mmCIF file of C-alpha atoms in Angstrom:
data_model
loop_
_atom_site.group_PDB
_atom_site.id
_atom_site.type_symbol
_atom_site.label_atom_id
_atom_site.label_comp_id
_atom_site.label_asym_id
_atom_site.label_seq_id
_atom_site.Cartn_x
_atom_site.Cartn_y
_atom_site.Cartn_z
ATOM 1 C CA UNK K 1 0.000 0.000 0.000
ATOM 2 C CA UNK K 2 2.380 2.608 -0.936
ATOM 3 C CA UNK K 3 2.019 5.368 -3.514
ATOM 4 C CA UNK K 4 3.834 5.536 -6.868
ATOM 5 C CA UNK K 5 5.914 8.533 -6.174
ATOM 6 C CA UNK K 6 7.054 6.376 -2.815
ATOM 7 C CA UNK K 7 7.607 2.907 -4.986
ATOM 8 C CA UNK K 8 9.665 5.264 -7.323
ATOM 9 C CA UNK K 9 12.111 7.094 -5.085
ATOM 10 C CA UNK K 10 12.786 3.628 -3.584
ATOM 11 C CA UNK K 11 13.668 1.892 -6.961
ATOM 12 C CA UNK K 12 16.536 4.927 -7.630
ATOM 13 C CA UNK K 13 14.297 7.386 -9.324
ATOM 14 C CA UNK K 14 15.147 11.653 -9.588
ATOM 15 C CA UNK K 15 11.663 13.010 -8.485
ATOM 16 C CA UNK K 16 10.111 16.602 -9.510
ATOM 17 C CA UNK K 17 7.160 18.635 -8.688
ATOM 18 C CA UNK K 18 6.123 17.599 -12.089
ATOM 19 C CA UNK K 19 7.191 13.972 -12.116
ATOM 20 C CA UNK K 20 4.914 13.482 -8.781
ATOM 21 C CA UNK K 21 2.057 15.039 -10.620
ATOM 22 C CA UNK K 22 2.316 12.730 -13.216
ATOM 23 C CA UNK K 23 2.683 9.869 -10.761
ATOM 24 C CA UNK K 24 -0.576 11.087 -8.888
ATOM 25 C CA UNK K 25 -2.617 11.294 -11.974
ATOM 26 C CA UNK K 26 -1.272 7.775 -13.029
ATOM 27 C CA UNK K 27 -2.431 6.689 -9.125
ATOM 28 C CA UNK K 28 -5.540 8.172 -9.474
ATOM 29 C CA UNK K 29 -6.478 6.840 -12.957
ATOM 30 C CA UNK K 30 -9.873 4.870 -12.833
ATOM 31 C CA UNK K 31 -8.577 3.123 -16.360
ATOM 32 C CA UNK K 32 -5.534 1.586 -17.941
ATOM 33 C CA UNK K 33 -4.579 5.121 -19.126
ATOM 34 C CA UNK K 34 -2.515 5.693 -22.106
ATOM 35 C CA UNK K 35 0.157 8.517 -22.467
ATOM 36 C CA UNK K 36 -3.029 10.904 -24.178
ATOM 37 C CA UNK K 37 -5.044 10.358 -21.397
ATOM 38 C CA UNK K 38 -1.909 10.692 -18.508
ATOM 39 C CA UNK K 39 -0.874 14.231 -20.176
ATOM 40 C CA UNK K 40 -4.589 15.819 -20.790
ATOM 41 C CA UNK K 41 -5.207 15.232 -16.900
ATOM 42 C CA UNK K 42 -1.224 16.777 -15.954
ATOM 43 C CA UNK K 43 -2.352 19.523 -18.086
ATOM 44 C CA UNK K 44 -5.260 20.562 -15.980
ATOM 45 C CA UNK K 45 -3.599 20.244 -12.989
ATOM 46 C CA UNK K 46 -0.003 21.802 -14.313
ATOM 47 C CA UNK K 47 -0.337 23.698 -17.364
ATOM 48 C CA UNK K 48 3.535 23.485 -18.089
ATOM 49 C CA UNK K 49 3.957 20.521 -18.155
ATOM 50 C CA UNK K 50 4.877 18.779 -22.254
ATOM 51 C CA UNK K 51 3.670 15.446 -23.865
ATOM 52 C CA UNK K 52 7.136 14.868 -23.826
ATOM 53 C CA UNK K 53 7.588 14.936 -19.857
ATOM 54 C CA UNK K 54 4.662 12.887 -19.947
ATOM 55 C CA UNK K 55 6.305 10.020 -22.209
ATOM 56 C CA UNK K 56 9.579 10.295 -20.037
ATOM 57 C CA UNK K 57 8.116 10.028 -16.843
ATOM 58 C CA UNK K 58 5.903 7.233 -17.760
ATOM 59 C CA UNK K 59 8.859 4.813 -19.330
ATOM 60 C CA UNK K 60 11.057 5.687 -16.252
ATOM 61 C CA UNK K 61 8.810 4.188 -14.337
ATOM 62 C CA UNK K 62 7.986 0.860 -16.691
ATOM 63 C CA UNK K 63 11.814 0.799 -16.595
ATOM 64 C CA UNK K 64 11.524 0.301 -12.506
ATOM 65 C CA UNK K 65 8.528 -2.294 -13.340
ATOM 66 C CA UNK K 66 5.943 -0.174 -11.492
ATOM 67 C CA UNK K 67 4.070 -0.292 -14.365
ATOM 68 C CA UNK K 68 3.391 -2.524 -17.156
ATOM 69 C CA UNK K 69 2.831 -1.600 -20.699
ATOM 70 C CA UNK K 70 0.427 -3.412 -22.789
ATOM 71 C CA UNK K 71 0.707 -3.114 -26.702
ATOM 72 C CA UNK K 72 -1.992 -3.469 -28.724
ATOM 73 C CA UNK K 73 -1.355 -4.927 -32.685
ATOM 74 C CA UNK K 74 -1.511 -1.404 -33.975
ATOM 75 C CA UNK K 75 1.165 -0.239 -31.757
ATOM 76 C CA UNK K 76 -0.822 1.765 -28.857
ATOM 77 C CA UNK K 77 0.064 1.365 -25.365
ATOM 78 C CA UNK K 78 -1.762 1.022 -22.449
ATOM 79 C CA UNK K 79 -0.858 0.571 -18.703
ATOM 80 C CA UNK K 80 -1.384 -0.830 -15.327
ATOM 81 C CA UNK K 81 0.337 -0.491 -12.121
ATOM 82 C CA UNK K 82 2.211 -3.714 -10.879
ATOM 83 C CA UNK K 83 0.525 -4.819 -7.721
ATOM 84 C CA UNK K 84 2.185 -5.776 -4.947
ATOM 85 C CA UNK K 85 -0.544 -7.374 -2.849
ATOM 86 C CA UNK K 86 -2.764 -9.110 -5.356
ATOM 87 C CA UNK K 87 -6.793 -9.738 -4.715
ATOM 88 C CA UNK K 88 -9.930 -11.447 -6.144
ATOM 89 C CA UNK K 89 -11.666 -8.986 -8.408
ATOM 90 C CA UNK K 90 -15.291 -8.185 -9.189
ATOM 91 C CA UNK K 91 -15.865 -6.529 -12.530
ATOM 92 C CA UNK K 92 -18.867 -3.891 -13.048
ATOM 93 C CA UNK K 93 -18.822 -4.889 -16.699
ATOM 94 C CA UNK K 94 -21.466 -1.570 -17.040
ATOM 95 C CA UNK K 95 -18.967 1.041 -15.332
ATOM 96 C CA UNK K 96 -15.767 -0.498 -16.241
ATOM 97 C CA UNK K 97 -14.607 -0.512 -12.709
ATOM 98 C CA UNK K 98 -13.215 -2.897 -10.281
ATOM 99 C CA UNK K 99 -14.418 -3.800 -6.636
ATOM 100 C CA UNK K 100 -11.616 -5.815 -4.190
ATOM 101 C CA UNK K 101 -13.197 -8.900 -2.366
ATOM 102 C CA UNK K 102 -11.886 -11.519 -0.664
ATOM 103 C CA UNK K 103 -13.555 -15.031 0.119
ATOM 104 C CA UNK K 104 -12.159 -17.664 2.583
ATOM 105 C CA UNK K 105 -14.694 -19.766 1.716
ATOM 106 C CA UNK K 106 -14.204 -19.742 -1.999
ATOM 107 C CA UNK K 107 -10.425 -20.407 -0.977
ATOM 108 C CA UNK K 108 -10.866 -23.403 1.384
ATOM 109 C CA UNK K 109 -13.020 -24.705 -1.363
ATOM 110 C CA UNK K 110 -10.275 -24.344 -3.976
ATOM 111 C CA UNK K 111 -7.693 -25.902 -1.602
ATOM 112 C CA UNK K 112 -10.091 -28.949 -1.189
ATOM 113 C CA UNK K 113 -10.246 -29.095 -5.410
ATOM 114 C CA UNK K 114 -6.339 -29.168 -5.711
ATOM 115 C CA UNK K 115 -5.839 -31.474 -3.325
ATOM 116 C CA UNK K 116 -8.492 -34.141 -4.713
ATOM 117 C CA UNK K 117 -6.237 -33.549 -8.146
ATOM 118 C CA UNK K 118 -2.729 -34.126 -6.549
ATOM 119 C CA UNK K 119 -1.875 -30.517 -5.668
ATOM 120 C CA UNK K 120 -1.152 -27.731 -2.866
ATOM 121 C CA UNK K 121 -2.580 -24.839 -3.798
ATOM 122 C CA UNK K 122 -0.319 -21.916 -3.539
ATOM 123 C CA UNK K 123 -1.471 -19.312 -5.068
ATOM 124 C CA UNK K 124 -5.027 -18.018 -7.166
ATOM 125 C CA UNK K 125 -6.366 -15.754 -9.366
ATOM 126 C CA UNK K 126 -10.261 -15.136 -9.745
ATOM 127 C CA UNK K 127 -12.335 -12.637 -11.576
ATOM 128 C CA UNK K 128 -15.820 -11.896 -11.688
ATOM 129 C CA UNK K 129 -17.923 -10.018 -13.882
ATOM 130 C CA UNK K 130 -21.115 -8.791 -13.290
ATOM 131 C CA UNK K 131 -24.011 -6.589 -14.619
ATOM 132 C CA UNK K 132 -26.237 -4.451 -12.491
ATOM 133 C CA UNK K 133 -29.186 -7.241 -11.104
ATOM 134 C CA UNK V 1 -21.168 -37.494 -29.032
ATOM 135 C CA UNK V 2 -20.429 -34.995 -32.157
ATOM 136 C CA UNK V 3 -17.158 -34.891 -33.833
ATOM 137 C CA UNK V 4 -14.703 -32.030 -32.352
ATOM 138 C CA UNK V 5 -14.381 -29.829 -34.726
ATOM 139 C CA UNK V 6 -9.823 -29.505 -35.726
ATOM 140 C CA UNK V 7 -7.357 -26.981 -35.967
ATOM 141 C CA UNK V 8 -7.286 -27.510 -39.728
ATOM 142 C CA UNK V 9 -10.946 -28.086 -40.247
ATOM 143 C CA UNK V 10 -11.793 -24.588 -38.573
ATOM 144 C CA UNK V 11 -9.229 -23.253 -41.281
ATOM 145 C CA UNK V 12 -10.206 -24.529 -44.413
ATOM 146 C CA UNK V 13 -13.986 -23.217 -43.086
ATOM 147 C CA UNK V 14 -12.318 -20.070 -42.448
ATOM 148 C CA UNK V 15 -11.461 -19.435 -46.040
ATOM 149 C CA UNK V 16 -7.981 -20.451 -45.587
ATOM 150 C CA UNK V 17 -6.211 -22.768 -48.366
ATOM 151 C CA UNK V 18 -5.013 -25.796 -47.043
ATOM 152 C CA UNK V 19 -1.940 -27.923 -47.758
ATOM 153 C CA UNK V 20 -0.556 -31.116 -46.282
ATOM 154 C CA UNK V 21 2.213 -28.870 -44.952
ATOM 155 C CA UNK V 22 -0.198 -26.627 -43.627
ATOM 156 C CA UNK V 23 -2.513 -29.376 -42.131
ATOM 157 C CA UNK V 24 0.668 -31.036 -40.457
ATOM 158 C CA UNK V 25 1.924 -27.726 -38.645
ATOM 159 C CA UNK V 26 -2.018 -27.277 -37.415
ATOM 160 C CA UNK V 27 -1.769 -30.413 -35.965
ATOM 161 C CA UNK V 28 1.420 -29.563 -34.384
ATOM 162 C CA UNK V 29 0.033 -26.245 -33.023
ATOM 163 C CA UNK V 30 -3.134 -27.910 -31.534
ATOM 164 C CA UNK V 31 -1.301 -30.984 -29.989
ATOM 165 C CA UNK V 32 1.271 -28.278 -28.373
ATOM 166 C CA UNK V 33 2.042 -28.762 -24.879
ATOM 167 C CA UNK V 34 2.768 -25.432 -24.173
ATOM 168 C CA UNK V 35 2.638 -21.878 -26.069
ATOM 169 C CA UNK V 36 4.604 -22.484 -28.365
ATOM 170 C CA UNK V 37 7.131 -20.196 -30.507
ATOM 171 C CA UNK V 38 7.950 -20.659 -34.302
ATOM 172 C CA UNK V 39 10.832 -21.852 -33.811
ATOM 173 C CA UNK V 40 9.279 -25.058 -31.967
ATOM 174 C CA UNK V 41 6.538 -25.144 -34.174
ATOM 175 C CA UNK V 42 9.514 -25.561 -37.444
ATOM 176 C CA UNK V 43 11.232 -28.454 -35.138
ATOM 177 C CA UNK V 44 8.586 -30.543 -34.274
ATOM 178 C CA UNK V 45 7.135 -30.103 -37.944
ATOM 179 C CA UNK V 46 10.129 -31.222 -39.601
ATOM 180 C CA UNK V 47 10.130 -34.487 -37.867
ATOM 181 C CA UNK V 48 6.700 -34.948 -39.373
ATOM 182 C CA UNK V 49 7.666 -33.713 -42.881
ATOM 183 C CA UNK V 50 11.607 -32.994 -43.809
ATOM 184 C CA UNK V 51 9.957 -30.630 -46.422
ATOM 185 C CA UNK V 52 8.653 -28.434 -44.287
ATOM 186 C CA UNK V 53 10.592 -24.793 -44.192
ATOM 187 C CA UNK V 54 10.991 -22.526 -41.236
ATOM 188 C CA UNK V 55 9.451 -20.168 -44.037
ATOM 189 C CA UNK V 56 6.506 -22.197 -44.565
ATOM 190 C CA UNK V 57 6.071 -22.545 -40.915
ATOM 191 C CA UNK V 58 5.922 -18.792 -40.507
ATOM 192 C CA UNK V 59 3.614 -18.128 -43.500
ATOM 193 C CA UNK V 60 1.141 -20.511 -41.889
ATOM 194 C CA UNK V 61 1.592 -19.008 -38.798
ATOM 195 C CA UNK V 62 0.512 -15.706 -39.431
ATOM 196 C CA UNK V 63 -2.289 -16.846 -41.695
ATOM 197 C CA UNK V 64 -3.691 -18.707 -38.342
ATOM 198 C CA UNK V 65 -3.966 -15.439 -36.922
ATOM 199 C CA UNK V 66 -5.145 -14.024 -39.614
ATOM 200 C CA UNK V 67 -8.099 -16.038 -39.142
ATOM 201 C CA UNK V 68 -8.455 -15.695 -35.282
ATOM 202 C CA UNK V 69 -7.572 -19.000 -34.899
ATOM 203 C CA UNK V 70 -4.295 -18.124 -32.627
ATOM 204 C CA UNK V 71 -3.274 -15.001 -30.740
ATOM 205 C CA UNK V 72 0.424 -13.732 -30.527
ATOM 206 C CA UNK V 73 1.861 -12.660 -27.128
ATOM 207 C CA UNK V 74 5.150 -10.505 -27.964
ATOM 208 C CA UNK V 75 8.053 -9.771 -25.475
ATOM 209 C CA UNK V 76 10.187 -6.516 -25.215
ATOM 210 C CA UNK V 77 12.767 -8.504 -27.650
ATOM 211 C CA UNK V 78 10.506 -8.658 -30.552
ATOM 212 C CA UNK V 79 9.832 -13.072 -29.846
ATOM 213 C CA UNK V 80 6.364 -14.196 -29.564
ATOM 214 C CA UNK V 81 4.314 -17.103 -28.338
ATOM 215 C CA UNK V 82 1.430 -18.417 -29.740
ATOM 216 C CA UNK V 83 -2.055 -19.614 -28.078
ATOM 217 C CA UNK V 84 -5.131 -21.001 -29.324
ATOM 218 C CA UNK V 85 -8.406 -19.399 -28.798
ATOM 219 C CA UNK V 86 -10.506 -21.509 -26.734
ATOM 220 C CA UNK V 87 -14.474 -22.395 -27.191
ATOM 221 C CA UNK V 88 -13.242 -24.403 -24.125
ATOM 222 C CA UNK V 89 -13.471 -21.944 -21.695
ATOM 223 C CA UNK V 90 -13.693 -23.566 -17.840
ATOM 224 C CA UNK V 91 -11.679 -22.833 -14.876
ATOM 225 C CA UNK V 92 -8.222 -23.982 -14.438
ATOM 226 C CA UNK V 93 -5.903 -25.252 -12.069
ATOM 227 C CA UNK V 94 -2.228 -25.145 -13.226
ATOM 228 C CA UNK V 95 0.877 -27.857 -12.376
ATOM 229 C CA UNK V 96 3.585 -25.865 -11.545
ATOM 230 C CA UNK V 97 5.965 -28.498 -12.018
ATOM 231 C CA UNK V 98 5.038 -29.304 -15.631
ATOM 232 C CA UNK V 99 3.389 -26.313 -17.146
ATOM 233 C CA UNK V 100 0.645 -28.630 -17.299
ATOM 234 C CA UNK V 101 -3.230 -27.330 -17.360
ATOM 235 C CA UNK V 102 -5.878 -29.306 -15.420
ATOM 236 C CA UNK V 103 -9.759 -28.701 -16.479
ATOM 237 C CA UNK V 104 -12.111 -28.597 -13.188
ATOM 238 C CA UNK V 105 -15.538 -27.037 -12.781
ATOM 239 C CA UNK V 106 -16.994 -26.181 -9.408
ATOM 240 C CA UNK V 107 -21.120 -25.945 -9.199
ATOM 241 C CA UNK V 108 -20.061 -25.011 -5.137
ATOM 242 C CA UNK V 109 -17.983 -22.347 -6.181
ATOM 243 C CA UNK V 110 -20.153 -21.001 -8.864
ATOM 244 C CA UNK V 111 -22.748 -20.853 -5.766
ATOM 245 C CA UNK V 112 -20.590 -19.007 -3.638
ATOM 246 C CA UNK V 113 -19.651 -16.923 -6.536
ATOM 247 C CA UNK V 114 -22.867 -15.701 -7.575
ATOM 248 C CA UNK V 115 -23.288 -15.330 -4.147
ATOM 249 C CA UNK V 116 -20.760 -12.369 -3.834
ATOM 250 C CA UNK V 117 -21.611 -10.842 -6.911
ATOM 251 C CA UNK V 118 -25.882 -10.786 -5.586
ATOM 252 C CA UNK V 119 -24.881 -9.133 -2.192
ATOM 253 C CA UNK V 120 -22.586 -6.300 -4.376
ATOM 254 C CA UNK V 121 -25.837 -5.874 -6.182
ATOM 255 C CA UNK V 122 -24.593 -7.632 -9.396
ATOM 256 C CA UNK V 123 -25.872 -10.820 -11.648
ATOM 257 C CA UNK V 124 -22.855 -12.734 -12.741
ATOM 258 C CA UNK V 125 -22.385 -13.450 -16.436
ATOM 259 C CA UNK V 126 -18.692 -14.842 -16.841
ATOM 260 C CA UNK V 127 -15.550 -15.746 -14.418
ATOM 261 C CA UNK V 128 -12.353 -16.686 -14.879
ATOM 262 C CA UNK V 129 -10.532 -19.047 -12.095
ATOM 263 C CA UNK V 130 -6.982 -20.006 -11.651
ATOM 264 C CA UNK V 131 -5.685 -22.053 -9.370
ATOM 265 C CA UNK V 132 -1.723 -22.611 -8.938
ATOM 266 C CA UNK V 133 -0.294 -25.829 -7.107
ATOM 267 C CA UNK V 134 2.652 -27.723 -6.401
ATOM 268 C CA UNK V 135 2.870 -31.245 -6.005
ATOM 269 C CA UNK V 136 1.089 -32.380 -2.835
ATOM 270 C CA UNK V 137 4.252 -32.925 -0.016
#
C-alpha cells in the first residue's frame, strides 16, 4: 500500500514537482490510461507541463517495473500499475470498474479441489464479472 | 457425441487454403504442450515432414492469426508465443511443475460466486478461475 511517487524514489528514481504530478494522476487513474489520457489530466492540474515529460516520466517508471505496458497490434500502449498485494476482483462490466473482495470460503473450497487432483494450492487468481441485477 | 471440430478443419472453413504442410503444422500447433514459438513449431514439424521450411512454418503461422484461430503474445525482444483461442473456456488449475493445465468445474464455487456478486448488487455473467499448485508434499 504505498504510492507511486514512494515505490519510485525507492527503486533509484530523480523526483520533480512535475514527475509526482504525473505519478498522482497515473495513481488516481480509474482506467488503464494511455500517455493521451496521462498528459490531458497533468495539463489541468499543471499547465507546463509537455507530452514529452509525460512520455519520459511514464517509461522511467515501466523501466523500474511499477508499471506494465500493454501493446496493442496497432502499436498503442496502455498501462497498469504492478501490484504488490494481489486480490480477487469483481468486474462492473457496465462502469468499467473494479471492486476488491476476498472469500475464505471460496479459498478453502479451492484448496479442497487441488488437493483431490494431486496438488497444494499456492497461489489463485479469480475474476468476476457482473451486470447491475 | 459430435465430432470435435480440428485446428485444420476450422481453417479450411475459415477461407484459408489448405496444404498437407499446412494441415501437419495445425496439428502440431493444436497438440502443443505449451505456447509455443515458431521456432518449436519448425522443429517438431520437420520431424513430421523434412519438407517443411521454417518459411513455410511462418507463412502458416501468421495466416492462423489471420483467421483468429491463434493469438500472438510478444516480449520486449521482438519473440512471440502463440495460443489457441478456446471455445473451451472452464476454470483452471495449473501444475507448476510441468506447465501442465488441469480442467475442473466447481457448481459449489459457482454458488458461492454468484453469491458475492448478488450481495454487491450484481448478476454474474462470466468468471475466470486459476488455481496454482505444487505437487502435494
Amino acid at each position: 500500500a504505498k504510492t507511486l511517487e514512494e515505490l519510485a524514489t525507492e527503486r533509484g528514481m530523480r523526483m520533480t514537482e512535475q514527475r509526482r504530478v504525473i505519478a498522482r494522476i497515473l495513481e488516481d487513474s480509474e482506467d488503464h490510461p494511455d500517455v493521451e489520457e496521462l498528459y490531458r489530466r497533468s495539463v489541468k492540474v499543471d499547465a507546463k507541463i509537455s507530452i514529452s515529460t509525460v512520455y519520459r516520466t511514464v517509461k522511467l517508471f515501466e523501466d523500474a517495473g511499477i508499471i506494465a505496458r500493454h501493446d496493442f497490434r496497432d502499436g498503442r500502449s496502455r498501462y497498469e500499475t504492478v501490484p504488490e498485494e494481489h486480490h480477487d476482483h469483481l468486474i462492473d462490466l457496465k462502469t468499467g470498474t473494479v471492486i476488491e473482495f476476498r472469500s475464505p470460503e471460496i479459498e478453502a473450497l479451492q484448496e479442497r479441489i487441488a488437493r483431490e487432483h494431486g496438488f497444494r494450492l499456492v497461489d489463485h487468481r479469480l475474476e468476476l464479472y457482473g451486470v447491475p441485477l
